[PDB]
Amino acid sequence: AIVKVFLALAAKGPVLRNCISTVVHQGLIRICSKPVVKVPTYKDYVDLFRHLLSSLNHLLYDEFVKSVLKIVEKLDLTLEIQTMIPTSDPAANLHPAKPKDFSAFINLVEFCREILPEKQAEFFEPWVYSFSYELILQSTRLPLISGFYKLLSITVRNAKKIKYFEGKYSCFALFVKFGKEVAVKMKQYKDELLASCLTFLLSLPHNIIELDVRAYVPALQMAFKLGLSYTPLAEVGLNALEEWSIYIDRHVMQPYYKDILPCLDGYLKALSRAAQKGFNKVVLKHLKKTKNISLEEIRIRVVQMLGSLGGQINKNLLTVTSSDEMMKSYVAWDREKRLSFAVPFREMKPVIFLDVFLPRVTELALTASDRQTKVAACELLHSMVMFMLGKATQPPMYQLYKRTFPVLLRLACDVDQVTRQLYEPLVMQLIHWFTNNKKFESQDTVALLEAILDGIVDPVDSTLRDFCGRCIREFLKWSIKQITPQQQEKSPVNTKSLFKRLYSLALHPNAFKRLGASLAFNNIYREFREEESLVEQFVFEALVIYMESLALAHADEKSLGTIQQCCDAIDHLCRIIEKKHVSLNKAKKRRLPRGFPPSASLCLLDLVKWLLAHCGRPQTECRHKSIELFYKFVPLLPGNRSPNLWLKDVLKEEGVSFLINTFEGGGCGLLYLRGPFSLQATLCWLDLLLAALECYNTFIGERTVGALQVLGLLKAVAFFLESIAMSPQEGERYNYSKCTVVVRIMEFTTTLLNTSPEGWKLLKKDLCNTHLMRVLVQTLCEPASIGFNIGDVQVMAHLPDVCVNLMKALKMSPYKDILETHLREKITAQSIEELCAVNLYGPDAQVDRSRLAAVVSACKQLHRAGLLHNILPSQSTDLHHSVGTELLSLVYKGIAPCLPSLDLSCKQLASGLLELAFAFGGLCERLVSLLLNPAVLSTAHFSHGEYFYSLFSETINTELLKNLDLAVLELMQSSVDNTKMVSAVLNGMLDQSFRERANQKHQGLKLATTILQHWKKCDSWWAKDSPLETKMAVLALLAKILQIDSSVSFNTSHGSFPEVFTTYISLLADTKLDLHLKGQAVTLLPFFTSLTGGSLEELRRVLEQLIVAHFTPRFNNYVDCMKKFLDALELSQSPMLLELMTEVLCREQQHVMEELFQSSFRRIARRGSCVTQVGLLESVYEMFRKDDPRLSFTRQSFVDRSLLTLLWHCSLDALREFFSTIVVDAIDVLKSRFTKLNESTFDTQITKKMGYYKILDVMYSRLPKDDVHAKESKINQVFHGSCITEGNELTKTLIKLCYDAFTENMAGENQLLERRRLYHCAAYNCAISVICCVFNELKFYQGFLFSEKPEKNLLIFENLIDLKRRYNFPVEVSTLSEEMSQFDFSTGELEMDELNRHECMAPLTALVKHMHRSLRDLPSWMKFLHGKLGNPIVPLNIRLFLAKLVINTEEVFRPYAKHWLSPLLQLAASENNGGEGIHYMVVEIVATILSWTGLATPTGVPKDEVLANRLLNFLMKHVFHPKRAVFRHNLEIIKTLVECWKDCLSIPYRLIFEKFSGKDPNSKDNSVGIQLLGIVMANDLPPYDPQCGI
């Protein structure tokens, strides 16, 4: 079916084929958004996406590729620190910024990995270049996102499956320059990211990239060592070794077998339920349902490879060098043997030396590969370490410590968590023990310290150095925490000797050897800056040695992280020299550092002169820091002098021959270089050229000196400029620094030509000569001719910013026409014509598309240059530029055919070409005349038009939006005859303004308010004989313009608000829309319910007409329309919707949509701003109070289920003005008299009284006692002014009034009972809720509400209880949410049976629990209930009420069942319970009387004895019940009863005898008696047949 509809909308036109590619891109986000570890994750759908590709396969292929790279653009996957000094790359970095986007990524890579592993025999060749290059960009910006290597490995395995590599050319160089870049980069990674990187690297061809095999061998001998625990990369290693050795020729491979091969030596070392019952077809069921690599194939592959390899090659497998570390494990650990263990038996106790199972224990502890043996070896090693430490305290062990101690570290930060919370306090404890004066200056301590330091400076264990840093921090902390400083003056473990260790580390010529010292200082700068008399001596010589180490760290690698740590190591010390030396300089002796001339005082001035003297280093990462320390170390000499004046103070009394040797260096001075190569002197001079080029670059652009006082080199650069246009393995290293320095030249020229010498072209006229205007015109256009490489992406995209900044800052010199006349050899427009051929998109691939791409890139930067009308002016016709109109018309003609074609990058060219062609002037009137066009394009049809819109709908829109405010008028001019096109284009501009809502905020609102006042000239839409799709387009546009707008255009007639509201009234009033097409209309309520009177009568009238008109797929219509009005009312707040919909909710008893009503009312009550909630409260009170003769059901239901919830759910904690205006608003109708004249004014007056009672109930309930009972605006409200009475003027006159209610007899009054009961009950609830809220502390609960005085016939209970109803009683039973919502913008406790729904029970139990958890028999609220129940003279309904009372709160009646024991059992024993005797109430009351067993026995009482015996005879009489489980339930009840009470229980007989005595054995009606006999034989009871029993 899915492929049927995808064939349906694919064979009619290209205007509708675009639907087929906007559906699938949407479906991918629909299924790639699920959870990842029941909802399926991503898995079941792979059957669908495999099945689809079965023409239409090609179309859904290209749709899948465009949609698979259109997600990976916009996810902003940049992870973030969320929390030591870390060294690893995702060390504590391992936290994404938005987590629900990463789970949209690692869902995506696996899905593409399983859908596109094949069926690419024809359809992946023209898709590899762009895929590879954009993935290379996103992976270069984001290295450590595991998965870009995964998608790249997919495309490169596909790039080996298709041939593609006979050497189209352009991908062959970025793979090389990326392969070497990942191969250098991947050292400092860990498990998953490294695994993905290796399966990238070894998937590269290398029988075509057989060049430079020497760098990848550590990416093959690391896959095999990373085998043995994880199989598939151990398989990709073996297949890499199988595809290298066969196709590489055997003279270049053969030296590289000594070290691939010796690491190939870890490899020569219901179902059963139906299956137990035979084989009879149900094993065929459980087998037919469930039917729709491992290391032994690896090992046999290894042996077959060694055989097929050779005979003289083959035996390298053990003799690479044959003495490395096997012997260093196969030697001892000592000479002598110590650690004598006297294993104690009873009398012998011999010895065993615990050394000979040390080298097995301290390997078992690290790599056991079994969880149970690892904790065993770890525990033994822990106790053995404690033993060997305690051994030496009553025997020198410093040959044993030296290889025990580098394993406690490697354990204490390894992986596991139990194994890690073990050995961390141990390694702290041995530090805290060896640093002590009781064991001071011992040779084990230096073994521990060297273990720490070689823990720091070590190649590949990235999570170990940052534990050794914390060790050195703790070591430095305890080196002064426990040694007295006057006995801390002498020892080699002092801080100074540790500092010398740090510097000697800090000057070794490998990177790891001084990165350790930088991490040590990064970890200890938090220390030592809080202790005085120590900062000012040696660490204040450490600054300049750290600068020199940063200088030494030049040549290593950018992506190792030596710069990134040493720069921090000096920054966090610069922030401590600029804290205390700002206010102190006592110029005594200090520590003289390395590289200075010596002196006797070292205050600051030598160092800042050194910073100014060492600014001309060629060390490209300490020159920058010396500059940016010079700029901050000028203003601390006591004049606080700015750099502008200070250099002029010191310069002139030193001279211009002082400020020129540093800036020029030894780099003044040959033309051997007709071949650009890398004789290593060339690089050091080129580095010197750069240093001398970039020293001036900051001081000229700063205000210390200008162009005069240093110039007064420039020949050397003009020597260079004839040479810059000019070993393929290291010649590119020279080519890097050859094509690096020209942008430093350009930055220098701009930062001199823009600054303070404005009127100065005084530079030499042979380095701004035609040399620079030849290399600039070869840098911009065609930069891959001067020696640029294709494959860098940083500089190859930073270049058109400085190369256009230079064309910017080259106009305020007289070289303006110099540039124009020098550029004008190609950029005359006739050349642009002669490249604009007729065959741009045809059979050719690069040969002219590239040659027009070069020129449009060039002139796009020329439009960006701030200068284009000097270059090319208009053909002298008018303000439409001629070649631009030629380009735009050629793009118009470039789509018409019998049939044309299209691609991806050709459309990139056709987009950029028009993006150039729009950049000249206005042209937009031509643009809308081209959009709106009635032209007829026939195909063997369509009007193209919107074809040309739908192709380019991201350039055309911003070209419209650039020239706003007149494009709208030029657009609305043709709204009569091109109605579909102007609706389409305006909706396009609208949803393009909304889609960048987070950016601009002006243009969408301005477009809305400009089009809202222009409705008067597009009025031919919403009238008669314009059928109901036109109006639907009008109302969709209404939804757009009124969903985007701010609160400016529609309130109080700002724009043309009369016209727009008459449009909405005329669109809703008609009969064309049936019901639910105006659902889009009725969503638009709150932008029209923002208004005062006037139009509201018409709006409420048409709403009334709607309601009286429109009120299985018809029940669904009821459901959706009711939810429609409810959700509209949910977000609006105006009390017109509420007063409309509550008229139509309140019509029946229990509407089926009632939970939606109460839920959305709950959503209404809490929305803040108490002035409008209390407005709704006044709306519902006045609509309840007024004199409309409403129905008693309706008038009742108003106050029942309209405002009670809104006063319940969350009204306000301090809304009491409604309580201030309700008091003498309701007490007047409360205190009236029953005029029994007609029954309507009788009972409607009653319902008004009930409504008063209920609202007083809810307002009395949820308040503290102060604002009902104290000096507040309750007494100050109901009385006059501010009175002196305390609180007792409202409570007593409410209490006496509610107690005067519900005591009225109705002996002669039978006119009305069914509602007078409800009035009496509501008055009772009001009484309860006022009395619990007043005081609640003394002899008033017994007095009031209870113990009436029946002398004048007072009747509390039996009045309010019903006493006529036969109670029924049956027997027993991110960012993808945005791109998924943009698709939506542009389209569209107890149980309740009978006695708990009695509208008194829950407040009664609340009062009973309130009596218990607030404060024989009791006062009068118990003894009265005790006598109330045991007399069989009340009718059963009230006794049953009190029984349901005592079951629900039995926790408070269990301490007094020694009196409450008879009448419950009297209710069960007296054969009175109605019908056949209700058994569920009986099982409930017997349950609660046997519940408190052990107290108040059912045994002994002479009434209760015979009552329990007749109880038991009844119970055993009624048991049978043909339902199966209630039989067993009743039997368990009888078993419980005889097993509990069984003492005064006289056992019954002859009923069991008559039970099983039945003859005719063909029905099972004897089982009951024998099962009852088993019940009685189980405990203690014999068949005591001597009786009246037989």
Short mmCIF file of C-alpha atoms in Angstrom, two decimals, residues 1320-1508:
data_model
loop_
_atom_site.label_atom_id
_atom_site.label_comp_id
_atom_site.label_asym_id
_atom_site.label_seq_id
_atom_site.Cartn_x
_atom_site.Cartn_y
_atom_site.Cartn_z
CA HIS A 1320 -30.73 18.75 55.51
CA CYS A 1321 -27.61 16.76 54.62
CA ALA A 1322 -25.85 19.74 53.06
CA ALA A 1323 -26.66 21.73 56.18
CA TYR A 1324 -25.11 18.91 58.22
CA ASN A 1325 -21.93 19.08 56.14
CA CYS A 1326 -21.84 22.86 56.61
CA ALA A 1327 -22.21 22.30 60.36
CA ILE A 1328 -19.33 19.82 60.38
CA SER A 1329 -17.06 22.07 58.32
CA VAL A 1330 -17.69 25.12 60.48
CA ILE A 1331 -17.36 23.31 63.83
CA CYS A 1332 -14.08 21.59 62.92
CA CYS A 1333 -12.75 24.99 61.82
CA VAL A 1334 -13.80 26.70 65.03
CA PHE A 1335 -11.50 26.17 68.02
CA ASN A 1336 -11.69 22.37 68.12
CA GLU A 1337 -10.29 21.81 71.62
CA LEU A 1338 -12.94 21.20 74.31
CA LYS A 1339 -16.38 19.86 75.33
CA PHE A 1340 -18.17 20.98 72.16
CA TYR A 1341 -17.96 18.04 69.75
CA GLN A 1342 -20.09 16.05 72.20
CA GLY A 1343 -22.43 18.95 72.92
CA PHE A 1344 -23.12 20.39 69.50
CA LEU A 1345 -24.12 18.20 66.51
CA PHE A 1346 -25.16 15.35 68.83
CA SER A 1347 -27.56 14.41 71.65
CA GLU A 1348 -30.62 16.31 70.52
CA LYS A 1349 -33.48 17.07 72.91
CA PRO A 1350 -36.51 15.07 71.71
CA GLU A 1351 -38.94 16.71 74.16
CA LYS A 1352 -40.07 19.06 71.37
CA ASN A 1353 -39.43 16.31 68.75
CA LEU A 1354 -35.84 16.87 67.63
CA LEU A 1355 -34.51 14.27 65.18
CA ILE A 1356 -30.88 14.40 64.03
CA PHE A 1357 -30.11 11.11 62.31
CA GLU A 1358 -33.38 9.49 61.22
CA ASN A 1359 -34.47 12.71 59.56
CA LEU A 1360 -31.43 13.00 57.28
CA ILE A 1361 -31.19 9.25 56.59
CA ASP A 1362 -33.45 8.00 53.78
CA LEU A 1363 -35.19 4.99 55.47
CA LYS A 1364 -37.25 4.06 52.42
CA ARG A 1365 -34.84 2.78 49.77
CA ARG A 1366 -34.28 -0.97 49.60
CA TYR A 1367 -30.49 -1.21 49.51
CA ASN A 1368 -29.53 -3.38 46.52
CA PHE A 1369 -26.49 -5.38 47.74
CA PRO A 1370 -25.69 -8.32 45.43
CA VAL A 1371 -24.00 -11.37 46.87
CA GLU A 1372 -20.19 -11.12 46.71
CA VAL A 1373 -18.80 -9.94 43.41
CA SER A 1374 15.27 19.13 20.77
CA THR A 1375 15.79 20.57 17.24
CA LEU A 1376 13.89 17.66 15.78
CA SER A 1377 10.91 18.78 17.81
CA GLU A 1378 11.45 22.09 16.03
CA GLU A 1379 11.74 20.55 12.57
CA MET A 1380 8.67 18.44 13.39
CA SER A 1381 6.64 21.45 14.54
CA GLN A 1382 7.58 23.48 11.48
CA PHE A 1383 5.77 20.78 9.50
CA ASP A 1384 2.80 21.59 11.74
CA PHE A 1385 2.93 25.36 11.16
CA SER A 1386 2.84 25.26 7.38
CA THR A 1387 0.15 22.55 7.11
CA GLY A 1388 -1.97 22.27 10.28
CA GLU A 1389 -8.63 5.23 49.23
CA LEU A 1390 -12.03 3.60 49.74
CA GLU A 1391 -14.43 1.70 47.49
CA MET A 1392 -17.88 2.96 46.56
CA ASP A 1393 -20.93 0.73 46.13
CA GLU A 1394 -24.02 2.02 47.96
CA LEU A 1395 -23.25 3.36 51.41
CA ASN A 1396 -20.25 5.45 50.38
CA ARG A 1397 -22.17 7.54 47.83
CA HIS A 1398 -24.48 8.80 50.57
CA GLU A 1399 -23.08 12.41 50.58
CA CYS A 1400 -22.31 12.29 54.32
CA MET A 1401 -19.85 9.44 54.75
CA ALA A 1402 -16.46 10.86 53.77
CA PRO A 1403 -16.83 14.03 55.92
CA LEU A 1404 -18.08 11.83 58.74
CA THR A 1405 -14.99 9.64 58.59
CA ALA A 1406 -12.93 12.81 58.30
CA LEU A 1407 -14.50 14.04 61.51
CA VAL A 1408 -13.89 10.65 63.17
CA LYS A 1409 -10.23 10.60 62.18
CA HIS A 1410 -10.13 14.26 63.18
CA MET A 1411 -11.38 13.25 66.63
CA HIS A 1412 -8.61 10.65 66.84
CA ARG A 1413 -5.65 12.57 65.41
CA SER A 1414 -6.66 15.84 66.93
CA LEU A 1415 -7.21 14.99 70.60
CA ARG A 1416 -15.18 2.01 79.03
CA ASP A 1417 -17.31 4.46 76.94
CA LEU A 1418 -16.62 8.17 76.14
CA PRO A 1419 -18.50 11.48 76.82
CA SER A 1420 -21.74 11.15 74.75
CA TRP A 1421 -20.52 10.55 71.15
CA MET A 1422 -19.87 6.83 71.93
CA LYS A 1423 -22.21 5.61 74.71
CA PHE A 1424 -25.03 7.05 72.60
CA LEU A 1425 -23.81 5.09 69.57
CA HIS A 1426 -23.44 1.97 71.74
CA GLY A 1427 -27.04 2.17 72.88
CA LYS A 1428 -28.02 3.27 69.37
CA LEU A 1429 -27.14 -0.04 67.72
CA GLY A 1430 -27.96 -2.86 70.18
CA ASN A 1431 -31.64 -2.03 70.46
CA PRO A 1432 -33.50 -3.69 67.54
CA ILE A 1433 -35.98 -0.82 67.33
CA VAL A 1434 -34.31 1.60 64.90
CA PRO A 1435 -35.07 0.56 61.30
CA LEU A 1436 -32.21 -1.34 59.74
CA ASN A 1437 -31.03 1.45 57.42
CA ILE A 1438 -29.59 3.56 60.24
CA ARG A 1439 -28.00 0.54 61.96
CA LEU A 1440 -26.48 -0.43 58.62
CA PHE A 1441 -25.26 3.17 58.25
CA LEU A 1442 -23.49 3.03 61.59
CA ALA A 1443 -22.09 -0.37 60.65
CA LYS A 1444 -20.60 1.09 57.48
CA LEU A 1445 -19.35 3.91 59.69
CA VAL A 1446 -17.56 1.57 62.07
CA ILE A 1447 -16.02 -0.55 59.34
CA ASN A 1448 -14.41 2.41 57.58
CA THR A 1449 -12.54 3.75 60.63
CA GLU A 1450 -12.00 0.64 62.74
CA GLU A 1451 -8.55 1.89 63.82
CA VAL A 1452 -10.25 4.16 66.37
CA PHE A 1453 -12.89 1.64 67.53
CA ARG A 1454 -10.45 -1.20 68.17
CA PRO A 1455 -9.42 0.21 71.61
CA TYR A 1456 -13.06 0.06 72.70
CA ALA A 1457 -14.51 -3.13 71.29
CA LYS A 1458 -14.73 -4.50 74.84
CA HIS A 1459 -17.98 -2.55 74.73
CA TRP A 1460 -18.34 -2.61 70.92
CA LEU A 1461 -18.74 -6.36 70.68
CA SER A 1462 -22.45 -7.22 70.79
CA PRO A 1463 -24.42 -5.09 68.29
CA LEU A 1464 -22.25 -5.71 65.23
CA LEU A 1465 -22.79 -9.41 65.83
CA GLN A 1466 -26.43 -8.70 66.60
CA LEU A 1467 -26.74 -7.30 63.07
CA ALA A 1468 -25.20 -10.47 61.63
CA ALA A 1469 -27.22 -12.82 63.85
CA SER A 1470 -30.66 -11.20 63.60
CA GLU A 1471 -32.19 -12.66 60.44
CA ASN A 1472 -33.19 -9.18 59.33
CA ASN A 1473 -30.74 -8.09 56.59
CA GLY A 1474 -33.28 -8.07 53.76
CA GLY A 1475 -33.96 -10.63 51.05
CA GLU A 1476 -32.05 -13.88 51.44
CA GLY A 1477 -29.77 -12.17 53.97
CA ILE A 1478 -26.98 -10.07 52.50
CA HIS A 1479 -23.71 -11.94 52.79
CA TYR A 1480 -21.10 -9.35 51.83
CA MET A 1481 -22.02 -7.02 54.70
CA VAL A 1482 -22.01 -10.09 56.97
CA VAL A 1483 -18.53 -11.20 55.88
CA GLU A 1484 -17.30 -7.64 56.37
CA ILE A 1485 -18.63 -7.31 59.89
CA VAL A 1486 -17.43 -10.77 60.94
CA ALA A 1487 -14.02 -9.79 59.54
CA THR A 1488 -13.83 -6.66 61.63
CA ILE A 1489 -14.98 -8.40 64.82
CA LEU A 1490 -12.43 -11.20 64.45
CA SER A 1491 -9.76 -8.71 63.36
CA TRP A 1492 -8.82 -7.57 66.88
CA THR A 1493 -8.37 -11.11 68.16
CA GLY A 1494 -6.65 -11.53 71.51
CA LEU A 1495 -8.70 -8.67 72.96
CA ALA A 1496 -12.48 -8.65 73.56
CA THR A 1497 -13.24 -12.30 72.86
CA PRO A 1498 -16.43 -13.54 71.12
CA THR A 1499 -16.37 -16.25 73.80
CA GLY A 1500 -17.97 -16.19 77.22
CA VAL A 1501 -20.71 -13.58 76.93
CA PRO A 1502 -24.09 -15.32 77.53
CA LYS A 1503 -25.97 -13.39 74.86
CA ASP A 1504 -23.03 -13.58 72.45
CA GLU A 1505 -22.59 -17.30 73.16
CA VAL A 1506 -25.98 -18.27 71.75
CA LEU A 1507 -25.69 -15.53 69.13
CA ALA A 1508 -22.33 -16.85 67.94
#
